[PDB]
Amino acid sequence: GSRYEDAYQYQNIFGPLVKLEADYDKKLKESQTQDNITVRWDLGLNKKRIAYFTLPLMQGDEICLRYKGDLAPLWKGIGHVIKVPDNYGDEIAIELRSSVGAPVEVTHNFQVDFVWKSTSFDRMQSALKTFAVDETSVSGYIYHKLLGHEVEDVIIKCQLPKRFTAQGLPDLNHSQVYAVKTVLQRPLSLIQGPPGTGKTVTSATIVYHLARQGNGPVLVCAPSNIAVDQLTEKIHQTGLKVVRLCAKSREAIDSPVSFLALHNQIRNMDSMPELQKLQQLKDLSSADEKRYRALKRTAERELLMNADVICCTCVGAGDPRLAKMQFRSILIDESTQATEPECMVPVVLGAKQLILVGDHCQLGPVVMCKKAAKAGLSQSLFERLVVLGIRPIRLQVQYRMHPALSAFPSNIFYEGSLQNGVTAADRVKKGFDFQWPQPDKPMFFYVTQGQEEIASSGTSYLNRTEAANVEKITTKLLKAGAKPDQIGIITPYEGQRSYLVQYMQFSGSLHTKLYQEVEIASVDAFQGREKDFIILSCVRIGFLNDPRRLNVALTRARYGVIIVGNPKALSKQPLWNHLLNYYKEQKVLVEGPLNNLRESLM
Ligand SMILES: Nc1ncnc2c1ncn2[C@@H]1O[C@H](COP(=O)(O)OP(=O)(O)O)[C@@H](O)[C@H]1O
Numbered sequence: 336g337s338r339y340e341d342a343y344q345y346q347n348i349f350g351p352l353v354k355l356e357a358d359y360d361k362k363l364k365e366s367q368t369q370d371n372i373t374v375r376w377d378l379g380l381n382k383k384r385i386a387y388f389t390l391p392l393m394q395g396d397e398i399c400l401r402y403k404g405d406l407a408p409l410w411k412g413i414g415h416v417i418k419v420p421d422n423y424g425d426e427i428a429i430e431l432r433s434s435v436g437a438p439v440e441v442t443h444n445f446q447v448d449f450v451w452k453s454t455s456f457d458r459m460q461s462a463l464k465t466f467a468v469d470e471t472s473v474s475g476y477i478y479h480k481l482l483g484h485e486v487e488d489v490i491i492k493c494q495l496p497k498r499f500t501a502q503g504l505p506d507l508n509h510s511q512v513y514a515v516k517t518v519l520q521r522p523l524s525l526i527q528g529p530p531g532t533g534k535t536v537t538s539a540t541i542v543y544h545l546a547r548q549g550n551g552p553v554l555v556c557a558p559s560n561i562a563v564d565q566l567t568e569k570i571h572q573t574g575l576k577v578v579r580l581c582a583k584s585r586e587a588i589d590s591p592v593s594f595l596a597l598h599n600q601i602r603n604m605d606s607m608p609e610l611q612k613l614q615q616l617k618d619l620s621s622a623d624e625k626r627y628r629a630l631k632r633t634a635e636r637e638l639l640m641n642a643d644v645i646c647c648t649c650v651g652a653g654d655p656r657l658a659k660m661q662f663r664s665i666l667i668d669e670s671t672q673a674t675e676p677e678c679m680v681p682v683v684l685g686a687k688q689l690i691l692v693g694d695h696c697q698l699g700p701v702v703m704c705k706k707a708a709k710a711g712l713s714q715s716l717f718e719r720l721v722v723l724g725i726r727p728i729r730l731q732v733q734y735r736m737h738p739a740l741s742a743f744p745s746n747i748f749y750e751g752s753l754q755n756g757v758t759a760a761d762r763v764k765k766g767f768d769f770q771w772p773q774p775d776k777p778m779f780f781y782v783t784q785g786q787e788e789i790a791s792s793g794t795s796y797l798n799r800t801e802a803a804n805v806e807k808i809t810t811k812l813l814k815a816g817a818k819p820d821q822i823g824i825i826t827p828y829e830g831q832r833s834y835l836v837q838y839m840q841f842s843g844s845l846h847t848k849l850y851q852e853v854e855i856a857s858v859d860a861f862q863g864r865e866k867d868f869i870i871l872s873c874v875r876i877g878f879l880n881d882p883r884r885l886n887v888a889l890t891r892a893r894y895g896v897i898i899v900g901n902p903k904a905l906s907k908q909p910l911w912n913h914l915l916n917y918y919k920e921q922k923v924l925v926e927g928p929l930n931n932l933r934e935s936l937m
């Protein structure tokens with residue numbers, strides 16, 4: 336199978352895969368350069384200059400603004416993004432690191448360059464090298480297991496808790512008790528967590544018990560900053576001392592766990608007086624600067640080494656500030672959303688016990704370079720271990736959706752093993768006068784008989800008439816009660832996206848402020864997320880090709896899903912024909928005007 340004979344071969348194969356995607360990312364980013372750009376200058380209340388502009392991306396990313404004009408400036412300046420193009424406008428916004436000599440005077444002939452950073456790629460490469468050359472990087476049993484070698488099982492002989500539920504978190508259910516129990520006694524384990532089944536509550540519980548033992552700080556990571564914040568919050572609810580490690584650039588940002596950030600916890604220490612004043616002084620002196628970094632370093636080191644838990648994105652585990660720290664226990668949440676070299680960044684920090692939590696029946700790792708993806712980069716560590724025979728313990732109680740919405744996804748994607756920790760009356764809105772075709776089934780496939788073109792732009796599709804019908808659905812949910820920001824429109828094409836945002840503006844029944852808050856995106860953007868109501872626009876790639884994309888799209892909703900597509904055309908994909916026939920049995924493949932809904936017979 337996907338079995339390696341040693342770590343040198345393992346590096347020999349994954350290392351090149353990382354190089355492929357690192358340069359692909361580089362070239363791509365360099366090709367995003369645009370010229371003849373109009374700017375709009377401003378001044379934030381911090382005195383840091385902000386610059387606005389539109390282009391023919393993610394918060395924190397660095398852009399490089401160059402003025403190339405006839406006048407006597409000719410200036411370069413780097414800043415970081417603070418607003419990306421969304422429902423408000425196609426505009427972008429950056430804040431300059433040093434606004435001393437910014438040409439606020441001019442505003443016409445600028446060039447924008449997206450600054451490529453090697454950091455993540457360098458750390459993945461370095462991680463692989465460590466896995467080959469440093470034998471202290473993983474226990475040996477872990478080494479044999481990751482390489483697909485057949486070694487006898489091992490049981491960790493820890494002190495088991497009498498009660499598995501942790502202080503401050505919800506009461507564990509049977510599948511979760513089984514998972515936390517089993518996992519504390521195994522040097523390596525996978526937990527599969529279907530939508531809403533308590534991946535993060537469970538993870539948080541496991542770290543509680545691993546931190547309640549006589550060993551060092553638990554390392555806890557995840558691929559996205561969002562995923563790490565959510566786990567950081569839950570760990571904090573259990574009374575443990577947690578430290579959130581932020582990337583230097585992202586340090587400037589406000590989350591629900593901003594007080595937990597290391598750089599903030601340092602800006603508040605009674606034990607370090609001389610440090611406080613120096614930070615309260617650059618509001619810089621050469622001799623004061625050497626004392627400031629020596630102290631900041633001393634402080635980081637204390638908070639880090641005496642924390643019960645260090646929370647970190649996978650790539651962020653390579654942080655220098657975590658220099659020469661080993662971590663006995665490591666847990667990676669949302670792990671099936673990382674590439675294997677990404678996960679190995681934390682793993683090689685001395686792992687004796689590893690727990691991967693994720694779901695290989697939902698979306699996999701994002702991989703730009705197609706050639707690297709097909710060669711193996713798109714398979715997560717979690718998935719490869721499953722292929723090698725490591726069976727995941729499954730969390731089978733879902734606390735997200737109306738039992739009706741869970742039926743189809745559970746049956747086709749989860750061997751019908753799921754159970755509902757919420758009932759129908761737990762997920763029915765109050766005073767909500769939006770009448771469904773079938774009262775106790777908050778769902779229906781609206782039969783839209785609409786045409787699809789290829790809007791003059793490039794290679795992207797859009798269903799013009801389907802977009803109109805989705806607007807009507809959205810208008811009905813809003814004037815029936817539902818808040819705008821609890822309505823998600825999911826579609827597989829960027830053409831439908833752009834056409835939808837602009838169609839709910841040029842000619843919508845209500846003002847563009849209600850629709851501005853309605854989030855429109857592909858399934859990719861919606862992973863690990865939920866809304867009360869989900870409208871699906873299948874304009875005829877995306878959630879109609881990959882079985883896993885359909886699973887994710889059908890499990891975002893809490894209170895109701897409404898699919899809008901052409902039944903005749905979608906029947907071509909096998910998965911959709913089954914979906915359509917099932918909606919028909921439950922009597923929710925409806926047709927006609929929204930206000931007098933009936934029942935199709937196609
Ligand atoms: N065993 C539990 N008892 C009560 N509620 C639970 C339990 N497990 C999960 N939940 C509920 O589900 C939510 C958390 O799910 P979460 O773990 O964040 O989702 P995911 O598995 O996708 O990470 C909470 O809001 C919580 O109320």
Ligand SMILES: [Mg+2]
Pocket residue numbers: 534535565863
């Ligand atoms: Mg989660």
